Design a binder for these strands. Structure first.
Ligand SMILES: [Br-]
Ligand SMILES: [Br-]
Ligand SMILES: [Br-]
Ligand SMILES: [Br-]
Ligand SMILES: [Br-]
Ligand SMILES: [Br-]
Ligand SMILES: [Br-]
Ligand SMILES: [Zn+2]
Lengths: 213, 295, 242, 267, 447, 300
RNA sequence: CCCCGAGAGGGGGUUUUUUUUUUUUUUUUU
């Protein structure tokens, strides 16, 4: 099959089988390989998620010259739940826009800050699901950047409510990103309030993690 | 068409002293005395065309002028360009030709000018003068073997551009003249580069003195802190009418611009000048105006 | 074994043409002024091709720069909706396509005067919107027209044509049905000459029939050259008169 | 972004756009679109086609092809394929727009998938192939207009055999010549620019470069619908925005969209 | 739309849908409209001036006689233009040396015949190709001629357009041959063309049905027997639709194969199926369903209770199929089935003799009789004839037209009279053509 | 990549030599290099040598399942990956370069597409199990003519290769080893041979496009030095049945049609000698293996 | 060679894809 991997025999076919509000866990700086890293685990109802973020930078960019730094974000599929490459790219773009509003790029001329988020373990226990993972990604990237020592304007956090994801800064006064799939009609005000509550809780736990730990 | 003008069409991918026109491969002449110029090639007595254009005869120099092609920098042209890259002791600026033009560090005026003593740190701090993206006036000082242009800004007339907006038209619509910087009604000034690159800015004191501590700030990105809306709305209008003249293949001159600017006053909102029928009529009105004024 | 009348005893083909008739040939110059220095939209039969010539201009990488000549690049984009049956995979990296791109470059390197444009790059982008036989010949005509529109110097026209061989009957300008039912020969003729820039035979052809097939193609390609030249002078007069 | 501008040009443009009476560089109003040209039904090989040309030379070509599939195994009945010329198939911009567009035109979200059903077992799979020849800004709204035009001039084959595969189970056979026009309601995707406290419809290239933020708002059945995405039009001047701006944008689209659709609904 | 080219050539778009294997593909080909299509008539004095040579530098020959078969006014001298149906039904009469001498076959007809029946299409092409001084057939490419090409009107079925196309060809030929005093006769059984010509709305076109045309010939009595045509206690079941059997074969429900019917037993047949080891038996007359020996038939497995000892859903039918394979291995009970469709008939021109039992010597008008085929594995055929006394003791050639679900025996028509039984001429000739042996002299193209 | 520097002197000399009917190796313009074919111990092992040019081909096969589209046809692939062993001019694994893709496409259209190998006879059980024949070409030493060398290497290998005999019990495949029963040869429908022509313009481009009398030089089977200085290439493939398998003049120096036809007729005389040569070396190889088999049994 | 300076100084001459009308005796000359 592939000349770079061992994928086994081709006639083989994969095994198909027959028939509080949120619980968080935060850890930072456990990857010596990079500059900043974070572990974010969430458990709620019939879905738990364990994702790992890793920040590599600021490192060299050998092309032209830039007064500010350049951020790149890449999401990788984990072991269990898989997602479309397109969908992972879309979230990556959405995350790039968010942290280009938070990261003090002016302090890193001709430098690159490459942020990796590994969707290691995403279990679906219900015996576009990507929308519920987005706030946890932002939490991991924020923790990793702060752990790396990359300057941030403010602790960026987010929340999710009925397929709507919105990330806040400045005590929830302003918005650094808005995401909406499916959901209902004229439910904007309700989503903003519910997400700001999650944003506030996540921000408190993040600060608590960056300080005490 | 209250919000958007959408023109539609079905079943089609798209809408569908004599100057001698010649095509590539066509035989132009069989007189071996001729000196073959650009647009041509020869074999013994036969002279053929390499491009599609009109046969040109100047003295004993036979050449074929192409119908199309990029701007070709002549020595002494007044061009407007953008810094593409900065290296060693020179900049490479985008003019709009086949190649980037060069701008040596010794071909510009350093800040503080004649009083300034020579420093070997200037070559390492060129980005503090002209960096990537900056616009500027420049004169084609010399030409390289291939045809590339070497630029210079050794004048107060030339230098970094500010206090305005950029727009471009095909270089064929702008010809050489005695001067390419012009003052127009509305307190705005146009810079008509021969390369087709045009700069519209608020009229400065220099622009007035042209027909009638500062040397340290000749490379500042900062604009005039006091620019009225009336000048800004004038720039937008001058921009649209220039695009309108370009849309009709009309050669842009300082007279055609002011004429169009005053003629466009018929339309209340400036945004009305972006529509096709408005552009076509404005250009058509200029040609007919020159018709009955000329005869 | 074909149950359809590829060439009836009445000398008529499936589309109505006779053995020596070209398809509907309609050229179009300066179709994308704001996207390229030169552009052409080709309609040869049901074939629909957009051709864009970008250059000569500065190379994006100084590593790839020749100080004696211009760099000529050709990328053919055969869209997934070019045929009746939509192709699932892309053709961008297909070896068949890389050969086509390479072939086209090798053709115009000896026609386009790259020597007079040193330290520059000429990028040729092609989009095949619809395909119906003789796509190689149509690709050749599209590049030749677009290059001329860009005012890029070249020695002569290069006209492309395809000729099928149904047993003993030669068929000028083949469509998809005819190509599936017989071997075809693709020609790339320079100007009004007998010299071939491109000779392409991919299926079996008797050695005795090949010379006659070439003769038909060259004659047909000359007609393609005339149509290209005609439409070009027409556009020239409409522009030079303003 | 695409366009390269100096710091001075950006400052002038920003101040001009961030002004309380928002001044556009072309003199437009905060709700005025630039003139576009649309061609349809030029690809006979396909079931439907469109070609949109912008004023800045931006050009997009959409093709519509159909295929009979078993809707019991084929979940997605409408697949959007995006190809931006000059970009890799796995580019960030390409895949993002591809993912976005597929959500805009989902089977049970913004499209009446009932009109694609043939029998109790088989339905029509619609392949929407996008080809962006040229673009100088975020082409998401450009592509949306073309897809709309294409889907409103699409003709599919007509079924002959019975429509009950559970019992009699007849092989799907179609008429030799007659084709039924695809009656469907394609959604639209509008893109907005946020400069200071002002919101602009149809952001130009130079405008997007200095914008603080942007919005991607879908539109279907005379109302705002998902996907709704905030988007950084550039990456050097991205700032957070007040919630009222978000509500202003949704309101702005909600009143100017029917005007766009009306100019677009002409057969 | 329609584009005009430089050569005076035109071009339009022919678009159709091809259903294959449950698939739907939109096929589009370009359609060129010429202006140099020859009428191929000896009388014509305009066409040879506009005709062009083919690939081998050979101008086409004008073969249609300048003095065709003259018939009682107002027909006079005339050419015959055929419809699609009259070709499919009476191809035997179209090969008869004693009628149809100058015939014009429209392109649209030739195309429809090719799609509906390839072997008939080949026989029709042979008549065109082997044109001599006795029989002359041509193919007028009406779809390619700009003068005769018609396009589908809004809300018009394809069958009516094609009939209008044929009618336009007749109209064109009629006007084109006026100076030569040669009329055109449209032989069609379709009631649409006859009604459209009877009303005489646009142009005057002589329309006759097949039987009605034969009754205008000098030798009407000699060729009337070649015209294609309660008689039951029970009724055969209808054949399944093509769409049904196609889905059946694809879903492993129905199965096709060649059926064998022995002369020792006409009430039992057996089909050779690839999925089954031993041949599936077909017991009964309703189960055989008017099938002949050697026919490719499509069979459906009968319930296990209906099997021989020497269901609703498709799932149960595939289970029945498996139980059938098991039963064939056990050799105790053997599975039975019923034919529900005839893929390819083994029908051809058969040799036989009239049964003296079904012919009444007292009858003077037309009467139904039976013919005993020389193939002992084949049933007998019903024949409409008036010369029943003249064909009593002779070897005759007949061809089967159809076998209605009502009729107990298949229906056919008379073709040739080989001669008296037990004669060297008739017996040798019958012997040859029964074993498929071409004995006719080599054509001109061969020599 | 790594370039081969060619001086003006060398360019002018080799071209001027051609103008004087001289080529460095002493061959003639229409002279093909002597092809040497050596078979290894195993079947499918063949070594082709043309002067200094050295190529090696290895034919192998393994049980595999056919594609859904073609349930009656076996699998067949041809590999021609270049390596720095043939010269530092070649990048390791460069399978997208102009010359590489061309060569890859010439061989494919000459052997695969042409149906030189009977893929129908590679099927064991329809739609289930079949043979997957693989032709691996190894470019050892490059002195030009890699296409012609490969086409001979592939064909000689396929005709020399023998696959293990197979008896079928339903779907149970009994693969007999070479120890039990003898292996079975492959089915070859025809024997395609490539002949490559190199074109040189002794004058300038102007006299090539608009020149009256043609003067372009064409030589058969160019060496590396001649290959690096040519202006155009032509690869024509024929067989003993007097038919053109494929022709590929992908651009390059515009050439007269009658001259290209002359090349095709000249190539036909070469492919005839080469084909007969291959057959003879295969017979002698068979006679050699049989004579040793008799001397092994007699001593046993 | 080209650019620059009242005084032979300086700057440059560009880096795998439109392929499927199925049936009952050896051999030779006819
Ligand atoms: Br493996
Ligand atoms: Br230049
Ligand atoms: Br609406
Ligand atoms: Br025939
Ligand atoms: Br079966
Ligand atoms: Br197969
Ligand atoms: Br050598
Ligand atoms: Zn006539």
């Amino acid at each position: 099959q592939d000349r770079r991997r061992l994928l086994g025999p081709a006639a083989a076919k994969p095994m198909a089988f027959s028939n509080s509000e949120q619980e968080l866990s935060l850890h930072t700086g456990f990857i010596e390989n990079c500059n900043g890293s974070a572990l974010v685990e969430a458990r709620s109802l019939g879905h738990q998620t364990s994702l790992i973020s890793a920040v590599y930078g600021p490192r060299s960019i050998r092309g032209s010259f830039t007064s500010q730094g350049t951020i790149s974000i890449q999401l990788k599929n984990g072991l269990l739940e898989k997602y479309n490459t397109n969908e992972l790219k879309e979230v990556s773009s959405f995350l790039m826009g968010i942290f280009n509003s938070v990261v003090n790029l002016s302090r890193y001329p001709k430098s690159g800050i490459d942020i990796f988020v590994y969707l290691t373990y995403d279990k679906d226990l219900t015996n576009s699901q990507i929308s519920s993972l987005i706030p946890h990604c932002i939490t991991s990237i924020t923790l990793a950047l702060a752990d790396a020592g990359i300057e941030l304007v403010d602790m960026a956090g987010a929340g999710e409510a009925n397929g709507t994801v919105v990330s806040f800064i400045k005590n929830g006064e302003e918005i650094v990103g808005f995401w909406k799939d499916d959901g209902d009609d004229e439910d904007l005000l309700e989503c903003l309030d519910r997400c700001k509550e999650q944003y506030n809780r996540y921000r408190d736990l993040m600060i608590s993690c960056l300080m005490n730990q | 068409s209250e919000v958007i003008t959408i023109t539609k069409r079905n079943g089609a991918f798209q809408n569908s002293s004599d100057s001698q026109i010649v095509t590539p491969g066509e035989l132009v002449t069989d007189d071996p005395i001729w000196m073959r110029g650009h647009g041509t090639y020869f074999l013994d007595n036969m002279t053929y065309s390499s491009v599609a254009g009109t046969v040109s005869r100047v003295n004993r120099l036979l050449s074929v002028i192409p119908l199309k092609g990029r701007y070709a920098p002549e020595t002494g042209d007044h061009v407007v360009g953008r810094i593409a890259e900065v290296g060693n002791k020179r900049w490479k600026v985008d003019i709009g030709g086949k190649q980037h033009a060069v701008l040596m560090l010794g071909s510009v005026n350093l800040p503080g000018g004649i009083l300034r003593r020579k420093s070997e740190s200037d070559e390492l701090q060129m980005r503090s003068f002209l960096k990537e993206g900056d616009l500027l006036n420049a004169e084609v000082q010399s030409l390289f073997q291939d045809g590339s242009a070497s630029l210079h800004t050794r004048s107060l007339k030339y230098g970094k551009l500010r206090n305005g907006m950029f727009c471009q038209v095909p270089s064929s619509l702008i010809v050489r003249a005695k001067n390419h910087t012009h003052n127009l009604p509305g307190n705005i000034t146009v810079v008509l580069g021969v390369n087709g690159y045009i700069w519209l800015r608020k009229t400065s004191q220099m622009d007035l003195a042209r027909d009638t501590e500062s040397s340290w700030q000749i490379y500042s990105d900062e604009n005039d802190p006091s620019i009225s809306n009336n000048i800004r709305q004038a720039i937008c209008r001058y921009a649209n009418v220039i695009k309108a003249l370009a849309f009709c293949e009309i050669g842009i001159t300082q007279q055609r611009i002011v004429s169009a600017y005053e003629a466009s006053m018929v339309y209340s909102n400036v945004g009305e000048l972006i529509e096709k029928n408005v552009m076509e009529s404005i250009g058509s009105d200029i040609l007919t105006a020159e018709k009955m004024r000329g005869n | 074994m074909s149950r359809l009348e590829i060439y009836s005893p009445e000398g008529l083909r499936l589309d109505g043409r006779r053995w020596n008739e070209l398809r509907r040939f309609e050229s179009s110059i300066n179709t994308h002024p704001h996207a390229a220095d030169g552009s052409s939209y080709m309609e040869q039969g049901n074939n629909k091709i957009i051709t864009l010539v970008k250059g000569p201009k500065e190379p994006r990488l100084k590593s790839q720069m020749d100080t004696s000549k211009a760099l000529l690049n050709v990328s053919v984009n055969i869209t997934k909706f070019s045929k009746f049956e939509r192709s699932k995979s892309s053709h961008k990296n297909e070896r068949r396509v890389l050969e086509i791109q390479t072939s086209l470059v090798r053709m115009f390197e000896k026609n386009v005067m790259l020597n007079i444009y040193p330290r520059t790059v000429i990028d040729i982008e092609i989009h095949v919107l619809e395909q119906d036989g003789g796509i190689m010949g149509s690709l050749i005509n599209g590049i030749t027209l677009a290059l001329i529109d860009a005012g890029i110097s070249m020695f002569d026209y290069i006209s492309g044509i395809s000729v099928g061989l149904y047993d003993t009957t030669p068929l000028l300008d083949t469509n998809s049905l005819e190509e599936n039912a017989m071997s075809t020969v693709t020609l790339g003729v320079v100007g009004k000459s007998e010299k071939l820039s491109l000779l392409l035979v991919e299926d079996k052809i008797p050695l005795d029939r090949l010379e006659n097939v070439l003769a038909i193609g060259i004659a047909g390609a000359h007609r393609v050259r005339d149509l290209m030249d005609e439409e070009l002078r027409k556009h020239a007069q409409k522009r030079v008169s303003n | 972004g695409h366009m390269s501008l100096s710091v001075a040009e950006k400052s002038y443009l920003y101040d001009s756009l961030a002004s309380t009476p928002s001044i556009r560089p072309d003199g437009r109003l905060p709700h005025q679109f630039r003139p576009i040209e649309i061609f349809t039904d030029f690809l006979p090989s396909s079931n439907g086609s469109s070609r949109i040309i912008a004023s800045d030379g931006s050009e997009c070509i959409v093709s519509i092809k159909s295929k009979v599939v078993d809707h019991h195994v084929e979940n997605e009945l409408l697949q959007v394929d995006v190809d931006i010329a000059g970009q890799r198939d796995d580019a960030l911009v390409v895949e993002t727009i591809t993912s976005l567009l597929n959500k805009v035109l989902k089977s049970g979200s913004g499209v009446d998938s009932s009109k694609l059903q043939l029998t109790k077992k088989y339905s029509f799979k619609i392949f929407v192939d996008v080809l962006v020849i040229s673009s100088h800004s975020h082409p998401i709204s450009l592509i949306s207009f073309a897809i709309y035009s294409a889907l409103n001039s699409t003709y599919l084959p007509k079924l002959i055999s019975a429509f009950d595969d559970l019992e009699v189970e007849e092989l799907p056979t179609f008429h030799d010549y007659d084709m039924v026009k695809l009656d469907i309601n394609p959604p639209l995707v509008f893109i907005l620019a946020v400069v200071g406290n002002n919101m602009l419809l149809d952001p130009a290239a130079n405008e997007s470069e200095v914008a603080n933020n942007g919005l991607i708002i879908s539109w279907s059945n005379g109302k705002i619908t998902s996907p709704i995405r905030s988007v950084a039009l550039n990456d050097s001047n991205v700032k957070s925005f007040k919630p009222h701006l978000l509500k202003q944008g949704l309101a702005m689209v909600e009143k100017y969209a029917p005007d766009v659709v009306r100019s677009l609904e002409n057969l | 739309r329609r584009k005009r080219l430089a050569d005076g050539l035109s071009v339009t778009q022919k678009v159709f849908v091809r259903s294959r294997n449950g698939g739907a593909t939109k096929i589009v080909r370009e359609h060129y409209l010429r202006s140099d299509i020859p009428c191929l008539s000896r009388s014509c004095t305009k066409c040879p001036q506009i005709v062009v040579p083919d690939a081998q530098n050979e101008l086409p020959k004008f073969i249609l006689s300048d003095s065709p078969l003259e018939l009682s006014a107002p027909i006079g001298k005339h050419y015959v233009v055929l419809d699609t149906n009259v070709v499919l039904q009476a191809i035997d009469l179209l090969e008869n040396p004693n009628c149809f001498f100058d015939v014009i076959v429209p392109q649209i007809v030739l195309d429809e015949v090719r799609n509906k029946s390839y072997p008939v299409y080949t026989r029709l092409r042979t008549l065109c190709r082997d044109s001599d001084d006795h029989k002359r057939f041509i193919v007028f490419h009406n779809e390619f001629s700009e003068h005769t090409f018609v396009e589908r009107l809004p809300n018009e079925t394809i069958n009516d357009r094609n009939n209008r196309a044929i009618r336009k060809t007749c109209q064109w030929y009629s006007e084109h041959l006026k100076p030569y005093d040669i009329n055109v006769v449209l032989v069609t059984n379709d009631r649409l063309n006859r009604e459209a010509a009877t009303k005489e709305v646009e142009s005057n076109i002589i329309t006759k049905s097949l039987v009605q045309y034969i009754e205008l010939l000098p030798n009407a009595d000699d060729i009337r027997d070649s015209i294609p045509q309660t008689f039951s206690d029970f009724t055969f079941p209808e054949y399944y639709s093509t769409a049904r059997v196609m889905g059946g074969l694809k879903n492993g429900v129905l199965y096709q194969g060649n059926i064998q019917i022995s002369e020792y037993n006409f009430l039992e047949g057996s089909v050779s199926l690839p999925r089954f080891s031993k041949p599936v038996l077909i017991v009964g007359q309703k189960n055989l369903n008017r099938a002949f020996n050697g026919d490719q038939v499509i069979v459906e497995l009968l319930p296990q209770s209906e099997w021989k000892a020497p269901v609703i859903s498709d799932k149960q039918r595939r289970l029945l199929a498996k139980d059938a394979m098991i039963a064939q291995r056990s050799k105790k009970i053997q599975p039975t089935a019923k034919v529900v469709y005839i893929q390819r008939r083994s029908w051809r021109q058969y040799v036989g003799q009239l049964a003296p039992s079904s012919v009444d010597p007292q009858s003077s008008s037309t009467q139904n009789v039976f013919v005993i085929l020389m193939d002992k594995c084949l049933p007998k055929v019903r024949i409409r004839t008036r010369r029943a006394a003249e064909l009593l003791d002779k070897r005759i050639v007949i061809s089967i037209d159809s076998w209605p679900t009502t009729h107990k025996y298949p229906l056919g028509h008379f073709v040739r009279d080989l001669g008296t039984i037990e004669s060297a001429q008739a017996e040798t000739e019958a012997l040859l053509l029964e074993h498929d042996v071409e004995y006719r002299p080599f054509s001109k193209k061969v020599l | 990549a790594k370039d081969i520097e060619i001086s003006a002197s060398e360019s002018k000399f080799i071209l001027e030599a051609l103008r004087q009917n001289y080529r460095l190796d002493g061959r003639s313009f229409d002279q093909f290099r002597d092809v040497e074919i050596t078979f290894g111990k195993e079947f499918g092992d063949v070594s082709v040598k043309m002067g200094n040019t050295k190529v090696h081909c290895r034919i192998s096969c393994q049980i595999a399942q056919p594609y859904e589209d073609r349930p009656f046809e076996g699998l067949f692939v041809i590999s021609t990956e270049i390596s720095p062993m043939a010269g530092s001019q070649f990048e390791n694994g460069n399978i997208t370069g102009e010359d590489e893709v061309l060569c890859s496409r010439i061989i494919e259209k000459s052997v695969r597409r042409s149906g030189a190998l009977d893929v129908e006879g590679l099927c064991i059980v329809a739609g289930s199990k079949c043979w997957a024949v693989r032709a691996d070409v190894h470019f050892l030493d490059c002195d030009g003519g890699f296409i012609d060398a490969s086409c001979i290497a592939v064909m000689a290998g396929l005709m020399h290769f023998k696959k293990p005999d197979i008896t079928v019990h339903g779907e149970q495949i009994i693969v007999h080893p070479v120890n039990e029963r003898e292996p079975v040869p492959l089915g070859i429908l025809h024997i395609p041979i490539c002949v490559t022509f190199s074109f040189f313009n002794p004058q300038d481009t102007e006299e090539n496009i608009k020149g009256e009398t043609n003067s372009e030089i064409s030589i058969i089977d160019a060496t590396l030095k001649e290959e690096l200085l040519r202006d155009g290439v032509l690869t024509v493939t024929l067989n003993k049945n007097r038919e053109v398998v494929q022709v590929s003049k992908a651009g390059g120096l515009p050439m007269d049609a009658l001259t290209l036809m002359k090349c095709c007729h000249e190539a036909y005389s070469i492919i005839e000698k080469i084909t007969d040569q291959i057959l003879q070396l295969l017979k002698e190889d068979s006679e050699k293996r049989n004579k040793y088999a008799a001397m092994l049994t007699s001593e046993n």
